[PDB]
C-alpha cells in the first residue's frame with residue numbers, strides 16, 4: 193500500500209482576506225494592543241475576532257461597562273482592522289441559571305429577544321464592525337447549560353438575526369462557532385439538528401472550531417481531519433450557507449500539566465500551526481481565524497495562556513516567526529495548482545500545490561516518517577524550512593533530490 197493526501201484548493205487564497213486572528217484586546221491596555229496590531233499588520237493581515245461577554249458588559253439591568261469597548265472600536269478603525277465580534281453568556285438579570293449555580297453566565301437567556309436587542313444596540317453603536325456573531329460553541333455544556341438545545345439556540349439565532357438586520361440588513365450575521373465538528377454529547381451534530389429546524393433559511397454564516405490533537409487528526413493512525421472537514425463543508429454548501437468560516441483553531445505552547453492537549457511547546461506550536469494552516473487554506477473555507485494573537489495572563493487557564501502568536505510583551509514567538517517566513521515565501525495570493533511529478537514520495541505524505549503572484553510554483557509537503565522524494569522533471573528549485581528559516585538551493589542534471597520532514601517545507605520551482 194501507499195497513501196498520500198493531496199489537496200488542491202477550490203479557489204485562490206488571498207491571505208489578507210482569508211486568514212484572520214482571534215484576539216483578546218480588552219485584556220490589555222491600548223498601548224499593548226496597539227503593539228499587537230503592529231505585529232499583525234507586519235504579517236499583511238487585517239481580520240480579527242473578538243469575544244464579548246454579556247455579563248461583563250452589562251453588570252446589572254441597563255447598567256453598562258462600555259468605556260473600554262468604545263475606545264477599542266475607535267482604535268480598531270484607526271488601525272484599519274476588519275473585525276467580527278461575538279456576544280456570549282447571559283447577564284445575571286436574564287440568565288436561566290438556578291440561583292445556587294456557580295456558572296451563572298454559562299446558561300442561555302430566559303428571553304432571546306433581550307439578548308437580540310443587546311446585539312442590535314452594539315451593532316448600532318459600532319457601525320464600523322464588519323460582522324456580528326451570535327453566542328459561542330452552544331454544542332458544549334460550558335457555553336449552554338444544562339445541556340445542548342438546538343431548538344433553544346435556533347430561537348436565539350433567529351431573534352438576533354432579525355434584530356441585527358433591522359439595524360443593517362446588508363451586514364453579515366454569523367452563527368455561533370460550533371466546537372469541533374459540531375458534535376453534541378447525545379451523538380447528534382448541532383449542524384444537522386439546526387438543519388431540521390430550518391435554520392439555513394436565516395442565511396447566516398456557518399462556522400466551527402475543528403481543534404484536533406495533531407494538525408491532521410487526533411491520532412497518528414487516524415489522520416482524518418481532511419475527511420471530516422470536507423464532509424461537513426460539503427453538507428454546509430449543500431444547505432446553501434452564504435459562507436463557511438472557521439472562527440477558531442490552534443495549539444497552546446504551555447508546559448503543562450496536561451489538560452486535553454499534549455505538551456508540544458513553542459516549537460511544536462509553530463510546527464502544528466503551519467501544517468494545519470497548509471491544510472485549511474486548501475479546503476473549502478472562505479475565512480479562518482487562528483487562535484490566537486497573544487499569550488494571556490493569569491486570568492486565563494494554564495493552557496489558554498499560551499496560544500499566542502505573540503508573548504505577553506507582544507513580541508514574536510517561534511510560531512509568529514515561522515508564519516512570517518511562510519507568508520513571505522507564498523506572497524500575498526496563491527492560486528490552486530498541482531504538485532510536481534514525484535517518484536517515491538513517502539507513505540503518509542501530505543502534498544499541496546499552488547502558484548504565487550510571480551508565477552512560480554509553491555509545493556507544500558511533509559510526512560510523519562520523513563525520508564526523501566525525487567522530482568524527476570526539475571533541475572533547480574529552492575527549498576524553504578519556515579521553522580528554521582533555512583533556505584536550500586536544490587539542483588540536479590536530471591531531477592531533484594528533496595528531503596522530506598515531519599514538519600512543513602516549501603519548495604519553490606518552475
Ligand SMILES: OC[C@H]1O[C@H](O)[C@@H](O)[C@@H](O)[C@@H]1O
Nearest residue numbers: 218219243244245248249491
Ligand atoms: O475576564 C477576562 C477579561 O476579559 C474581558 O473581556 C474584560 O471584561 C476584562 O476586563 C476581563 O478582565
Ligand SMILES: OC[C@H]1O[C@H](O)[C@@H](O)[C@@H](O)[C@@H]1O
Nearest residue numbers: 329371401403440452483496
Ligand atoms: O477557546 C479555545 C477553546 O476551544 C475549544 O473550546 C477547545 O478546543 C479548547 O481546546 C480551547 O481552549
Ligand SMILES: OC[C@H]1O[C@H](O)[C@@H](O)[C@@H](O)[C@@H]1O
Nearest residue numbers: 405406411412413454455456
Ligand atoms: O501517539 C502520539 C502521542 O503519544 C504519546 O502519548 C505522547 O508521546 C504524545 O506526545 C504523542 O503525540
Ligand SMILES: OC[C@H]1O[C@H](O)[C@@H](O)[C@@H](O)[C@@H]1O
Nearest residue numbers: 487488497498502503504505
Ligand atoms: O505563559 C506565557 C507567558 O509566560 C511568561 O510569563 C513569559 O515568558 C511571557 O512572555 C509569556 O507570554
Ligand SMILES: [Cl-]
Nearest residue numbers: 523548549550
Ligand atoms: Cl510573488
